[PDB]
Amino acid sequence: LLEKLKKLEEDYYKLRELYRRLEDEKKFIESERIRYEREVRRLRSEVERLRSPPLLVGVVSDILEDGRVVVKSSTGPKFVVNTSQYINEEELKPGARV
Amino acid sequence: LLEKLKKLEEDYYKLRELYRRLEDEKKFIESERIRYEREVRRLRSEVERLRSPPLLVGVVSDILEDGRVVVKSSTGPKFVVNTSQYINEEELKPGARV
Q1: Among its keywords, does the record have Chaperone (chains A, B)?
Q2: Which of A48, A86, A58, A73 is nearest to B49 (CA)?
């Protein structure tokens, strides 16, 4: 009957369009993936320019609890300086070369 | 009549099914997107932390009553410095390393 078909036609149309727009949103996210991946590469490169020469000799004179480390530069000036996640406080002891 | 309605109705369902298939695959790329997004956040931090922007060390070798404090730096020279209102010169005395 005409009535039946007409109702089914409506329901499957809106359901088609629901899914279509979910497709488009997830398709452009494929581009967003590429962009973040590039940025994963990029930031890693900055880790390397840091570590690369020139490098300077220091010796940990002591560790301070104000969240700084006292380092005697071989150059001269003593300075209180920050640590990161790659450095452990297990590593650190008075007189540790750095 | 009922034939005309059945053809439009069929088409709509067939293209709904196409979308459902394509959805699942770009959802997978979404997963990769998330992972690479965490690393972009995490890496940024590790360069900032490794850089460790410093402070100089000095020792209050003399004190003035002009609100200036003459502080022998760990560089060598003696310098004339300005004291902060976090740390008063009521709390700085000769021999206090600063």
Answers
A1: yes
A2: A86
Is the CB of residue A50 less than 8 Å from the CB of residue B50? yes
Q: What Å distances lie between residue A96 and A77, A92, B18, B53, B87, CA to CA?
A: 17, 6, 64, 20, 30
Q: Does B33 touch chain A (CB under 8 A)?
A: yes
Q: What is residue B95's DSSP assignment?
A: T
Method used to obtain the model: cryo-EM
Is there a contact between B76 and A76 (Cβ–Cβ < 8 Å)? yes
Q: How far is Cα B75 from Cα B62, in angstroms, rounded to an integer?
A: 17
Joined tokens for residue A16: 């088609």
Site of tokens 């590790």: B46
Å resolution of this model?
Answer: 6.9
Residue type, A18: L
Does the beta-carbon distance from A30 to B27 stay under 8 Å?
no
Radius of gyration of chain B (CA): 35
